[PDB]
Amino acid sequence: ALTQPPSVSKSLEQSVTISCTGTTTGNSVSWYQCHSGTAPRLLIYDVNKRPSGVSDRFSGSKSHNTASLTIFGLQAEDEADYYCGSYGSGGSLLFGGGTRLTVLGQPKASPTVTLFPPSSEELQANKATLVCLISDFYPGVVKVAWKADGSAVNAGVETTTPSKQSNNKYAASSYLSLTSDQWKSHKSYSCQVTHEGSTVEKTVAP
Amino acid sequence: ALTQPPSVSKSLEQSVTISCTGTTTGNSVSWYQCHSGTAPRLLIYDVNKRPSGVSDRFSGSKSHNTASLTIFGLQAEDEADYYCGSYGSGGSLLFGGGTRLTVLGQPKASPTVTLFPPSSEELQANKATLVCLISDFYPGVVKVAWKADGSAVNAGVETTTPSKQSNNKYAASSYLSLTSDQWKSHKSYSCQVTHEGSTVEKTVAPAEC
Amino acid sequence: QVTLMESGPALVKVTQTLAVTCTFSGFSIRDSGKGVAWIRQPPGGALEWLTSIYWDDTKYHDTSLKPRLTIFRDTSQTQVILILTNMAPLDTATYYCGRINNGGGWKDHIDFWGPGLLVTVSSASTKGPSVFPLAPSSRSTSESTAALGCLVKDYFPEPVTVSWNSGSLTSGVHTFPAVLQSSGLYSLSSVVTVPSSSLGTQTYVCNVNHKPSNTKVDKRVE
Amino acid sequence: QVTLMESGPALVKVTQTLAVTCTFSGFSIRDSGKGVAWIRQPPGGALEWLTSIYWDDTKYHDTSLKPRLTIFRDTSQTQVILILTNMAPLDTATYYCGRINNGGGWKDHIDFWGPGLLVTVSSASTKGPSVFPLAPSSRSTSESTAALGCLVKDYFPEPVTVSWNSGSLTSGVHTFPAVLQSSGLYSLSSVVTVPSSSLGTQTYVCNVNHKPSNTKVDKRVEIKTCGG
Numbered sequence A: 001a002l003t004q005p006p007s008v009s010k011s012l013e014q015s016v017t018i019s020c021t022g023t024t025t026g027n028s029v030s031w032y033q034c035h036s037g038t039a040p041r042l043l044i045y046d047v048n049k050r051p052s053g054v055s056d057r058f059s060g061s062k063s064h065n066t067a068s069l070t071i072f073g074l075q076a077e078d079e080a081d082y083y084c085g086s087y088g089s090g091g092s093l094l095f096g097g098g099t100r101l102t103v104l105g106q107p108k109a110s111p112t113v114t115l116f117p118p119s120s121e122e123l124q125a126n127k128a129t130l131v132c133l134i135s136d137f138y139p140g141v142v143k144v145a146w147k148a149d150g151s152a153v154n155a156g157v158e159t160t161t162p163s164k165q166s167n168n169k170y171a172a173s174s175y176l177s178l179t180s181d182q183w184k185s186h187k188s189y190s191c192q193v194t195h196e197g198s199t200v201e202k203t204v205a206p
Numbered sequence B: 001a002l003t004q005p006p007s008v009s010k011s012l013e014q015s016v017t018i019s020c021t022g023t024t025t026g027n028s029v030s031w032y033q034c035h036s037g038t039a040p041r042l043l044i045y046d047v048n049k050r051p052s053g054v055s056d057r058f059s060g061s062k063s064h065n066t067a068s069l070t071i072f073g074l075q076a077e078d079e080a081d082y083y084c085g086s087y088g089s090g091g092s093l094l095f096g097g098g099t100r101l102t103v104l105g106q107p108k109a110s111p112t113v114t115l116f117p118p119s120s121e122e123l124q125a126n127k128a129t130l131v132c133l134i135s136d137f138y139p140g141v142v143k144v145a146w147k148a149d150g151s152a153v154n155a156g157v158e159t160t161t162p163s164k165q166s167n168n169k170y171a172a173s174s175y176l177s178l179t180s181d182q183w184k185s186h187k188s189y190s191c192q193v194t195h196e197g198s199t200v201e202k203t204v205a206p207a208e209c
Numbered sequence C: 001q002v003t004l005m006e007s008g009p010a011l012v013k014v015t016q017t018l019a020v021t022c023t024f025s026g027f028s029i030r031d032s033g034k035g036v037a038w039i040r041q042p043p044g045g046a047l048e049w050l051t052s053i054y055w056d057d058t059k060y061h062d063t064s065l066k067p068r069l070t071i072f073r074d075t076s077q078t079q080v081i082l083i084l085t086n087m088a089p090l091d092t093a094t095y096y097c098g099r100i101n102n103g104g105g106w107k108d109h110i111d112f113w114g115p116g117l118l119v120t121v122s123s124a125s126t127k128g129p130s131v132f133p134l135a136p137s138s139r140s141t142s143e144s145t146a147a148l149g150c151l152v153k154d155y156f157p158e159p160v161t162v163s164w165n166s167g168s169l170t171s172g173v174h175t176f177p178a179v180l181q182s183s184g185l186y187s188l189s190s191v192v193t194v195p196s197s198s199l200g201t202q203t204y205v206c207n208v209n210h211k212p213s214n215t216k217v218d219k220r221v222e
Numbered sequence D: 001q002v003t004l005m006e007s008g009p010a011l012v013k014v015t016q017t018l019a020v021t022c023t024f025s026g027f028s029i030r031d032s033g034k035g036v037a038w039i040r041q042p043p044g045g046a047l048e049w050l051t052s053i054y055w056d057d058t059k060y061h062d063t064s065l066k067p068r069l070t071i072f073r074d075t076s077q078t079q080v081i082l083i084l085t086n087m088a089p090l091d092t093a094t095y096y097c098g099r100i101n102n103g104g105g106w107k108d109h110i111d112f113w114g115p116g117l118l119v120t121v122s123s124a125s126t127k128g129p130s131v132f133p134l135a136p137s138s139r140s141t142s143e144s145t146a147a148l149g150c151l152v153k154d155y156f157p158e159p160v161t162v163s164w165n166s167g168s169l170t171s172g173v174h175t176f177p178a179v180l181q182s183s184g185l186y187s188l189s190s191v192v193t194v195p196s197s198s199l200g201t202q203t204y205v206c207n208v209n210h211k212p213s214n215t216k217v218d219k220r221v222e223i224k225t226c227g228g
Ligand SMILES: *[C@@H]1O[C@H](CO)[C@@H](O[C@@H]2O[C@H](CO)[C@@H](O[C@@H]3O[C@H](CO)[C@@H](O[C@@H]4O[C@H](CO)[C@@H](O)[C@H](O)[C@H]4NC(C)=O)[C@H](O[C@H]4O[C@H](CO[C@H]5O[C@H](CO)[C@@H](O)[C@H](O)[C@@H]5O)[C@@H](O)[C@H](O)[C@@H]4O)[C@@H]3O)[C@H](O)[C@H]2NC(C)=O)[C@H](O)[C@H]1NC(C)=O
Pocket: B091, D054, D055, D056, D057, D058, D059, D060, D061, D104, D105, D106, D107
C-alpha cells in the first residue's frame, strides 16, 4: 504494498480528501484513525460501507485499486493520524503508511522561535546548551544554518521534527549540543535557523 | 519422592554420611551442595566418583535405597545444605529433599562490631537510623542483651536469622529506624549479643542530644 | 460489549526476548467469525503487522518475522500470549492486541482493539547522575521568565521524563516539545516562559527521572 | 572455561507470564556428552527442576506443571529460552539455567550452573533505592571491628552491588540479613572491613550500583569522624 500521501488540509466543516492504493481482489481494504499513537479507530468495512456505531462525516468510496477517504465536514479530530489497510492471505494482514494531516484554516500560528541562554550551573551537567525554543509556525518548517561568530563548532543533531501542541500552535525544539569542554572551546553560539523564514541571534553567556 | 534427613551432626575433622532414601529406583546418582545461597556446587559426577573440587574429604558410595554421600575432615563450610540427584524415570530428572548439615562442637565467639548514628541525609528527612553491625560471631545463633533504651527490637529489625561472612564468622546487622524523637528518648545503645556464651560491647552518644 | 485488557512488562535490555499478554471480555469461542491479532509501532513511524489467530487453531504471521516469533493462547487460563526473540533496538515500540471477525468466504473484519503499551528497549549502559539547575542563580534569564531545573547530565539512550502543560492552561503556556540532544552523549531538558526565580510561590523547582535507568533525582538553587 | 547466566526482568504481575533466557560459552550445540536445562530454587530452602534440551534436539519437562511450562532455542541465536504461563506468589524463586553432562545410557549430572536470577511475583511494583555513606561519624571512631559502606534504604526488589576505591577495595565484605519495612520496601547496611585509625595517611571512597536500574555512583568519605 500500500501507499498514502504525507498530509492534506482545509478548514473545519469544509471538504478534503486523502489518497490510498488498493486492490479489486482485496476490496476488503479500509480506512482508520489513530491519535498520536493512542487507541486506533476503524472507519469503513471494506472500502465503502460504514459499520454500525461509526459516524458519517466522510466516505472512502467504492474506489477499488485506490481507497479514497473524502470528508464532507472537517472536525478537530481530522488531524489525528489516519491509516489505510486490508486482509492479506493465509492468516496475514496488509497495512499502509499513515498521514498526520492538518486542519489548516485554524488560526495561523506564528512566529515563535526564541533563545534562552545557559546558566553557569548548567556546566555541572556537562552542558551550556542553546535553549533554542521553537513554537508557532504554520505549517511547521525550519532549515539548517547555525553560527558561533569566527569559532569552529560541534553542533550535534539536536533539531526535532514539528510536533503536536496543547492548543494546536505547532512546535518543536533545537537545543544545540553545547558540552562544558565545547563551551570552553567555542563559547559564543547563536540560534540561527529559518523558523518559517524568521530567525533570532542573542549570542550566549552563562 | 527422594527423602533425605533434615540434618545430621558430627564434630570438627570427624566424619559422617548423608543419604537419599526414597524411590531410588534410579541407580546412577549424583550429589550437590548449596552454601550461603550461592550458585550450587557439584560433588559427585556418578555415584562413587568426583572431580577437582573436593577430591579427598568427600567420598561417593553405592546402595539401592541409601544413595549415599560419605564425608571426612569436617570443617566450617559443613553448615551448608546437600542434595541427591539420581537420573529419573526415563527422559526425566529429579532432586532430593535437601539436608542442611550441622557440624557440632565448633568454636564459640561473641561479636565484633561497628555501631553508628545515621549520616545527616536521614536527619534532614526527620528519621534517625542508628545501626549496630552485629558481626563476626560463632556459632550461627543469637541471644540478645541489647536491652539498653529498647535498642534490640524497634523499627527495621534485623535482630533476626544470621548470615555467613567471608571471614567465616556470622553476622546479623540491625537498625533503630525511628523518627528524630529517637534522640529525645533513647541515649545509649549497648549492643551486647551472646552465642551459646559470652558478650562484647559497643555504644555511641545520641546524634541531636 | 467486548473489551481487550492488555498487560505486559514495560522495559527491557537489547538482546533479550519479549513476551506480552491480553485477555478479553465477551466470548472465547473457538468457532464464530471472530479471531485475534497483534500490532506494533516504533514512535516516529507507522503501525505494523505481526500475527493472528483465526477461527479454530488456525494461526499465521509474516514470513519476514518467522524464526523470531511464536504465539500461543491458554483460554483455560483466559489468556492470549505473544513471544519474540532477541530485540534489536528498533524493536522498541508501542504494541497493541486486537480482534478480527468474518464477512464472506475468506474475507473479514479488522476493527477493535485493546489500550496498547510501550515496549521500551535500550542498552543497560547508563549512570547515576542527579538533575541540575538552569536557574537565575546565574544570569540565564530574568525572574519574570525562567525554569529552574529538569536537566540530567548525559547518557547513551534517551529519554529524560520531560513534560510541560497538561493542566487547565492549555494555551499561552503551550509546550516546546523535545526528544534528543547528541551533546557528546544523549541528553534532555525543556523550558516554558513562566515567571519563577524560586520554590517560594509555586513548584518551579523541576525534578525528574531518566527512563532507561529508573531513578528519580532532585536539585535546587534559588 | 564454561559460562552461563539467566538474564531477565526482576518482577511480574500475578496472572502474567515469566519469560527469560540463557547463553552458551566454551562448548557446542552438538555435544553428545552435554546439553542444557532449567531449574528453580524455592525461597530459603528446596530446589526444583523444570526442563531440558539435548544435542539430539529432542525435548523434556516434568508432567506436574506441563501446560504451564515451555522451552525452545532459536538456532539463529543459539540461546535457550524458558517460559512459564501464568504465575502465583509461590513461583517467587531464583531460577537457574545449567549445562547437563552425561555418562550416557540415561546417566546424567549438571556440570556447571550460572549465577542464577531471582524472580519476584506480586501485585505491587518497584521502588527506587535511597543512598547515603556509612563510616565512623562525628561522634565515633573506636569500633571493635571497623567498617565502611554505601548504606541503601527503601529499595525493591533486592539486586544491588558495592565496593570501595574505584570499585577495588573489597576486604571483609558480605551480605547481611536484608531489612524489611512493613510497606514491602527493603534496606541494607553491608560494608567493607577497613581500619578507622588510618585516615590521616590512608583514606577511602564508596562505590555502589543498583541493577533494575544501572544506577552506578561513587562518593568520597575521607574525613567523616570527629570523635572517639
Ligand atoms: C523411515 O521410516 C522410519 C519408521 O519406519 C522413520 O523413523 C522414525 O523417525 C522419528 C523421528 O523422525 C522417530 O520419532 C519418535 O518420536 C517420539 C514422539 O515424538 C519421541 O518421543 C519423545 O517422548 C517424550 C515423552 O515425554 C515427549 O515429551 C517428546 O515430545 C517426544 N519427542 C521428542 C522430540 O522428544 C521418540 O524419541 C526417540 O529417542 C529416544 C532417545 O533416548 C536415548 O538417546 C538420548 C540421546 O541424547 C539419550 O540422552 C538418552 O539417554 C537415551 O539413551 C528413545 O528413548 C525413544 O525410544 C525414541 O527412539 C522419537 O523421536 C521414530 O521413533 C522413528 N520410528 C522408529 C520406529 O524408529 C524414518 O524417519 C523414515 N526415514 C525416511 C528416510 O523416510
